Paper text:
The tripartite motif ([name]) proteins form one of the largest subfamilies of RING-type E3 ubiquitin ligases, comprising more than 80 members. [name] family members typically contain a RING domain usually catalyzing ubiquitin transfer; one or two B-box domains mediating protein–protein interactions; and a large coiled-coil domain region, which is involved in self-association or oligomerization with other [name] E3-ligase proteins. About two-thirds of human [name] proteins feature a [name] domain, also known as the [name].2 domain, in their C-terminal region. All characterized family members shared the same overall [name] twisted β-sandwich fold consisting of a 7-stranded and a 6-stranded antiparallel β-sheet.
There are significant variations in the length, conformation, and amino acid composition of the loops connecting the β-strands. For example, we observed a unique 11-residue deletion between β-strands 2 and 3 in the phylogenetically more closely related family members TRIM9 and [name]. Compared with the recently determined structures of TRIM7 [name] with a peptide substrate or a peptidomimetic ligand, the putative substrate-binding site in the structure of the two phylogenetically closely related family members TRIM9 and [name] was much shallower. This was largely, but not only, due to a distinct orientation of the β5/β6 loop. In TRIM9, this methionine, Met608, packs against Tyr619 on β-strand 6. The equivalent interacting residues in [name] exemplifying this loop collapse are Met680 and Tyr691. That this was seen in both the TRIM9 and [name] structures suggests it is an intrinsic property of this loop in these two closely related homologs, rather than being induced by crystal packing. In summary, our structural data provide a platform for future drug discovery efforts but, importantly, also hint at significant challenges in developing potent small-molecule binders targeting the canonical binding site, especially in cases of particularly shallow surfaces and those partly or largely occluded by either loop collapse (TRIM9/67) or dimerization (TRIM36).
Residue numbers in the entry: 609 to 772
Amino acid sequence: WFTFDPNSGHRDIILSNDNQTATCSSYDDRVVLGTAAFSKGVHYWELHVDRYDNHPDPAFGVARASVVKDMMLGKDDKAWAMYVDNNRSWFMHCNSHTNRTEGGVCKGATVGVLLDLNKHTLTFFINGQQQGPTAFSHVDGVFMPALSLNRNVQVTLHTGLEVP
């Protein structure tokens, strides 16, 4: 179980619903992290897309605590993310794009994030279906759940979820 960390986020992040819900005041992407740090075991969580207006690229994944908070997740070397619009996703890390996958998100979609620190992998799901191949492998160290979004998106966190 974790929530959004109100002390982790860019100041433009807006938390609500006992810190289970996030949006942003900015049209620029801003980061917020979860209250959990993972270093072992297998973790799965979901983000429900409460609101998706226009054509933004919210991003979902995991990060080091020192991730830059005022840019899309995966623009620096401290986050591993899937960014996704209404049409398609990309995987991003270190501002490098891999594995474009057709099929995106919309209001009512769910994004699932599977951080497997036994196998050292990060895998994404949309609406219960794996999105692309395993996104990143040989992932090591300590990760916090991460989100970036702007004012065109609102997401609600669902945690304490059984691994599929």
